[PDB]
């Protein structure tokens, strides 16, 4: 009896992948400071982002299969190179370094004398600088060299731009949509009872860190435990905190900028003498706040590893510095902190057997993150003492393979892949494409 | 905005206009662009208009020539989801609906462009002469 009829705009979608753009909230642009991080031409965010809750809908999510992570990961990487392209390349810094021990703590800093090319190509320049032990390597008084020269080339980051993370909303173009999981407890896998849609994702700060998720999103009620394959010890375990952890990372060295001239037109910023406290970089964590969280977190692992079992914590096993330490950026400088003091504990079924704690941190200006070869970035010196306060919102953890599985299990800080850091904020999001065209049988026919 | 996706097809016909609007047009709109990350905010919106005109051809070449809803002279085959009328709109949902028609979807498409607007417009030419 009936007849076919074309309906346009029916609620039908399929899971797919597209190219997502950013959103800066149109305030980051007023923050200026010559293109901070991403925001330059960055899409300002709709003042009123729209979130529509879909009733009577259940959708299955997988955060580990999420494509927004891979795009974001490649975005930061592509973003990094574009920042270093217009800046000043440090290529003729491979000159011999004659170094000596700084005036305590086994001479971590080296005072190095070397020859340099001036604006003119005729006469050289005899000048000295100050490099960390991590930035230099001796070759056989004490003679050193740049640590990256044998591996690759090097370029200096511009002092105008800042590495300051700013909120970035990922949005989808026309024909696409972004799904948001509104449940309080979600491990990133399984069906999602309450699903809402948004044009733009929430504020996401691209904070690059290791062993500690900084400035991230808090969980709801109970703390969350996420892992790709849990019984598998080869897979990292992502944790989401309820309450934020106060962390202080400072640069207890009050410095000055040389701004030496290697012209014509170019000026390099050398690290001058340190005026102030003679100290190594340090990281503070309040003993009461970390413990309280630990007691709550260690109980969540027993929802899997069993009601009663012994959970012991320990510092990093070994590997690259990026893996073994907490790597991040504060005030433009890159800190590498020793977390061994926090991870020293042993817990009972519900319990573990002072007013403050500190963590030794190391500073490295010349870095290759993401296993990049051919390009090394030099972090420019900062005037004065740098102080920063951030939230610790989560961790990257790995389980040991030694078993004795039915006895006890030990967990250690993870590292490596930075996608996990983005999976922390993107677990509730996935990309689907909308299929508007539809057909239905009805009597109307046509004349 | 997609709110009736969980609801029945009968209820999903009321908010049909909303999906048409938001889906159709999406301009932020920002002129600024750069050599890298400017090509990223381009490649996305260029694919948007390519996917769009792809849909619009079907609306024109079929018996619609207009948006939202339009009808046709193609009779509904029994072999295509033999059902009850109240079992479709009142008791069933679109996602659940498109699930079954997946086999006959390409067949119906042929009936719209060939059996109608190819043979209908020609029929019209023969009926408009007298």
């Amino acid at each position, epitope marked *: 009896n009936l007849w076919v009829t074309v309906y346009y705009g029916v609620p039908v979608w399929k899971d797919a992948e597209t190219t997502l753009f950013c959103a800066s909230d149109a305030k980051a642009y007023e923050t200026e400071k010559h293109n901070v991080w991403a925001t330059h031409a960055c899409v300002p965010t709709d003042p009123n982002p729209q979130e529509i809750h879909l009733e009577n809908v259940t959708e*299955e999510f997988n955060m580990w299969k999420n494509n927004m992570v891979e795009q974001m990961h490649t975005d930061i990487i592509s973003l990094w190179d574009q920042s270093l392209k217009p800046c000043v390349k440090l290529t003729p810094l491979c000159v011999t370094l004659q170094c000596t021990n700084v005036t305590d703590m086994r001479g971590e800093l080296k005072n190095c004398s070397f020859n340099m090319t001036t604006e003119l190509r005729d006469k050289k320049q005899k000048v000295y600088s100050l490099f960390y032990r991590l930035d230099v390597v001796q070759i056989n008084n004490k003679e050193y060299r740049l640590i990256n020269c044998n591996t690759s080339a090097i370029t200096q980051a511009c002092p105008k731009v800042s590495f300051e993370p700013i909120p970035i909303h990922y949005c989808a173009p026309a024909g696409f949509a972004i799904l948001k999981c509104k449940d309080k407890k979600f491990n990133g896998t*399984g069906p999602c009872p309450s699903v809402s849609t948004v044009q733009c994702t929430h504020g996401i700060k691209p904070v690059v860190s290791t062993q500690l998720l900084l400035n991230g999103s808090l969980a709801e009620e109970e703390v969350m435990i996420r892992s790709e394959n849990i*019984t598998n010890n080869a897979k990292n375990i992502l944790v989401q905190f309820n309450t934020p952890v106060q962390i202080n990372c400072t640069r207890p060295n009050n410095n000055t900028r040389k701004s030496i001239r290697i012209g014509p037109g170019q000026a390099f910023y050398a690290t001058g003498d340190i005026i102030g406290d003679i100290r190594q970089a340090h990281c503070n964590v309040s003993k009461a706040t970390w413990n309280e969280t630990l007691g709550k977190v260690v109980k969540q*692992l027993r929802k899997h590893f069993g009601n009663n079992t012994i959970i012991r914590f320990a510092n990093s096993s070994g590997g690259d510095l990026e893996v073994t330490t907490h790597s991040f950026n504060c005030g433009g400088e890159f800190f590498y902190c020793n977390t061994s003091g926090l991870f020293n504990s042993t817990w009972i079924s519900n319990t573990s057997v002072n007013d403050s704690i500190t963590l030794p941190c190391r500073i490295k200006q010349i870095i290759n993150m993401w296993q990049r070869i051919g390009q090394a970035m030099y972090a420019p010196p900062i005037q004065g003492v740098i102080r920063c306060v951030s939230n610790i919102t989560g961790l990257i953890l790995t389980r040991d393979g030694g078993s004795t599985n039915s006895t006890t299990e030990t967990f250690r800080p993870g590292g490596g892949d930075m996608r996990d850091n983005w999976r922390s904020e993107l677990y509730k999001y996935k990309v689907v494409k909308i299929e508007p065209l539809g057909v239905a049988p009805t009597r109307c026919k046509r004349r | 905005f997609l709110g009736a996706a969980g609801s029945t097809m009968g209820a999903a016909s009321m908010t049909l206009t909303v999906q048409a609007r938001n889906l159709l047009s999406g301009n932020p709109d920002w002129l600024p662009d750069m050599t890298v990350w400017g090509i990223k905010q381009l490649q996305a919106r260029v694919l948007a208009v390519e996917r769009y005109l792809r849909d619009q051809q079907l609306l024109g070449i079929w018996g619609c020539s207009g948006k939202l809803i339009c009808c046709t002279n193609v009779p509904w085959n029994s072999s295509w989801s*033999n059902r009850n009328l109240s079992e479709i709109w009142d008791n069933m949902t679109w996602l659940q609906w498109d699930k079954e*028609i*997946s086999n006959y979807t390409q067949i119906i498409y042929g009936l719209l462009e060939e059996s109608q607007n190819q043979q209908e417009k020609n029929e019209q030419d023969l009926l408009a002469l007298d």
Partner: antibody, heavy 132, light 109 residues
Framework: QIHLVQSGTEVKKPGSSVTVSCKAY?????????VNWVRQAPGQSLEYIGQ??????????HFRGRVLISAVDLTGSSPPISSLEIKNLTSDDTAVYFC??????????????????????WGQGTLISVSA | DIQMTQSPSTLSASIGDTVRISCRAS???????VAWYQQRPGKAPRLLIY???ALLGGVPSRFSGSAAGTDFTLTIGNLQAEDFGTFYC?????????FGQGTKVEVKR
């Protein structure tokens, strides 16, 4: 990959209660995977008993309420495990029981049809002989 | 409650032959929700085709399904040794799923 390892052979007497377990190896979770329990009578065809999907246990009108399907997700020491119980055992329940699962993540897959589905992965099977 | 009828209950076919096993449902299944399983003796049954023609990945191209209305048929061309066993047709169209009588594919000689 995906491996479904069930319990050993259970021989039980009428009136008693039986518990079989299904260890699902390779499965990330029962959230993205629906678990169906299917039995096969000797010399006869296959019969669908029940399922647990989106962590919701369900079963056919033959067995309503008399068959209980329970499951726990992936843990830190073992893969996701499901168990099927039949109380008030009789002599007609001697069929061979199979633990099955299907990937439900694909929303437009022909595998599933709103709770009722095909069965992609099959277990080793467990024979239950009820005799005194 | 659907009832699946397979024909025949058992058959004799040789190597290289084209084997056709049909099946009929107590009602008409549209959306083509039908599955075909293979079971070798002493082994758990394996899933071959879903949605009546949609072959699962890793299955040889020799197997072909067909789905129209109440009548369903599975077509196997160029029969080989490993193909012999008992086959079942199943409908997941409605709650609950029901299988067929079963068809024993037996070696010809």
């Amino acid at each position: 990959q995906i491996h479904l390892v069930q319990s050993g052979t259970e021989v039980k007497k009428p009136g008693s209660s039986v518990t079989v377990s299904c260890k699902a190896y390779g499965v990330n979770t029962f959230g993205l995977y629906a678990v169906n329990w299917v039995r096969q009578a000797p010399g006869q065809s296959l019969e669908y008993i029940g399922q647990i999907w989106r962590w919701k246990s369900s079963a056919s009108h033959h067995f309503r309420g008399r068959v209980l399907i329970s499951a726990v997700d992936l843990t830190g020491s073992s893969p996701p495990i499901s168990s099927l119980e039949i109380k008030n055992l009789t002599s007609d329940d001697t069929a061979v029981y199979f633990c099955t699962t299907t990937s439900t993540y694909d929303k437009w897959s022909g595998l599933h049809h709103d709770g009722v589905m095909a069965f992609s992965s099959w277990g080793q099977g467990t024979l239950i002989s009820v005799s005194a | 409650d659907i009832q699946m009828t397979q024909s025949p209950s058992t058959l004799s076919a040789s190597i290289g032959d084209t084997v056709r096993i049909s099946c009929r449902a107590s009602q008409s299944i549209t959306g083509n929700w039908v599955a075909w399983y293979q079971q070798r003796p002493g082994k758990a049954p394996r899933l071959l085709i879903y949605r009546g023609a949609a072959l699962l990945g890793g299955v040889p191209s020799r197997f072909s399904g067909s789905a129209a209305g109440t009548d369903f048929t599975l077509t196997i061309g160029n029969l080989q040794a490993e193909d012999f066993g008992t086959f079942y047709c199943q409908q997941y169209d409605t709650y609950p799923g029901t299988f067929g009588q079963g068809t024993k594919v037996e070696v010809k000689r």
